[PDB]
C-alpha cells in the first residue's frame, strides 16, 4: 500500500536500434503513415456536425491527407464524436476492434473524455470512452471549434511520428483467455423483423 495504482518498473530495458539506415527508413515509415490518416466516418451526436464542418470547404482536413472512410477495414483513425450510451458501447468497441492494427483514437468533445455534461444524473451514458478503447488524444469542449479538431490532429501527427518500427511489439493483443460453464437459461431474441406483419397490428383485440 506504499503507492496506490503503481507502475510497472520493468526489465529488459529497450532493445532499440541505432544505425542511421534503419532510423532513416523509420522516418519514411512514420511520414507515410501520419500524413495519410483516413478517419472512419463515425458520428453519434452533436460533435459529429463540427467534424462535418471540418470536412467542408471553410477548412477541410483534405490537406495533411485525411479522406473519410466508411468501412473500418480501411480506416486507421476513429474520431469518436458524440456521447456513447450503454446501448451503443459494444457497437463502438466492435468498430474499433474490427479495424487494422496501426490504428489511433481521438476523443473529441467533453462527452467522450470524462462523460461531459452527462457525468451526473445520467443512467445510460458511458462516462468517457477511455474506459472502452485506448484513446490517443483528448480535446475538451462542447462542440470544439473545428480548428481544435485540427489541433488534435496536429498533436496526433506529432505522436505518430514518434513510433519505432523496432517497437511494433506493443501493438498485438495478448489474449489471456479463460472459460467457465454456466447455467443461465438462453432466451429468444426479442429483436427481429415483423413490425407491420405482426398479428397485433392488423386488428384490435376483443
Amino acid at each position: 500500500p506504499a503507492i496506490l495504482n503503481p507502475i510497472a518498473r520493468p526489465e529488459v530495458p529497450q532493445e532499440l536500434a541505432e544505425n542511421i539506415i534503419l532510423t532513416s527508413l523509420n522516418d519514411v515509415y512514420d511520414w507515410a503513415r501520419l500524413s495519410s490518416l483516413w478517419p472512419l466516418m463515425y458520428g453519434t451526436a452533436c460533435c459529429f456536425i463540427e467534424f462535418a464542418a471540418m470536412i467542408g470547404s471553410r477548412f477541410d482536413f483534405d490537406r495533411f491527407g485525411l479522406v473519410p472512410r466508411n468501412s473500418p477495414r480501411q480506416a486507421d483513425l476513429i474520431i469518436t464524436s458524440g456521447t456513447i450510451t450503454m446501448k451503443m458501447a459494444p457497437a463502438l468497441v466492435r468498430l474499433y476492434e474490427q479495424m487494422p492494427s496501426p490504428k489511433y483514437v481521438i476523443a473529441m468533445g467533453a462527452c467522450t473524455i470524462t462523460g461531459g455534461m452527462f457525468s451526473s444524473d445520467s443512467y445510460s451514458a458511458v462516462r468517457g470512452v477511455d474506459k472502452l478503447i485506448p484513446v490517443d488524444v483528448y480535446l475538451p469542449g462542447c462542440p470544439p471549434r473545428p480548428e481544435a479538431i485540427m489541433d488534435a490532429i496536429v498533436k496526433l501527427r506529432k505522436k505518430i511520428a514518434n513510433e519505432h518500427i523496432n517497437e511494433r511489439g506493443n501493438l498485438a493483443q495478448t489474449h489471456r483467455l479463460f472459460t467457465a460453464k454456466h447455467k443461465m437459461k438462453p432466451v429468444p431474441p426479442i429483436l427481429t423483423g415483423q413490425y407491420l406483419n405482426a398479428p397485433s397490428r392488423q386488428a384490435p383485440p376483443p
Binding site: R63, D136, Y138, R145, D151
Partner: protein, 193 residues
Amino acid sequence: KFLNQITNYAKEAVQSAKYIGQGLSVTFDHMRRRPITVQYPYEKLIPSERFRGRIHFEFDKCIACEVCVRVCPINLPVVDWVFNKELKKKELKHYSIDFGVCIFCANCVEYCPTNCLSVTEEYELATYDRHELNYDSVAMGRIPYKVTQDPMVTPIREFAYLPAGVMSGHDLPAGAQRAGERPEAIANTAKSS
C-alpha cells in the same frame, strides 16, 4: 398514342442533356473563385468578442462564495476553502476546474460577483492524457494565447467583423473596421448639429 410518347421522350432527353451541361458549366466556373478555406495552422481564424474559451481565474479576487459551483450545470469547479478565524474571512486553498468535464457554457463567468472568473479565446486545448486537463489555481491564469501575436499565423476575421458588403475575410486591407460606427462616435456626431 405512340407519337406523344416519343415526343415526351425527346423532350425529356434533351432536357436532361441541357440540365447536365448547365451543371457542368457551373462547376467549371466554380474553380476560378478563390478558395474559402481558412488554412488553419497558418491562417488561424480570430475568434469573436464573446467566444467562450478556457476559463481564467484570478486567485486574488476569489472570495469563495461558491456561486461558480452552484450555477454550474454539473457543479464542476472544485473550491477548497478553510474559513480562517481572524474575524470571519474565508480563505481559499485550492481552486480547480476539470476542463475534461467542462461544458464551456460560462455560467460560472456570468455569476462571479468579483470579476474573478473570465473567459478567454484559447480553443487549442488538447492533451495526450486527460488527467492533465485538471487545471490548478495557477495553471488557469497563464496569460491567454492571443492568436494575433503569433509570428507564423495570418489572422482572419470572421463574418461579423468585416466591413459592410464584404463577405470573405481573406483579401482584406490593413485598415478595416467592424461594420458601422460605435455609439461614442454617433453621439459625437449628434453633438455637433
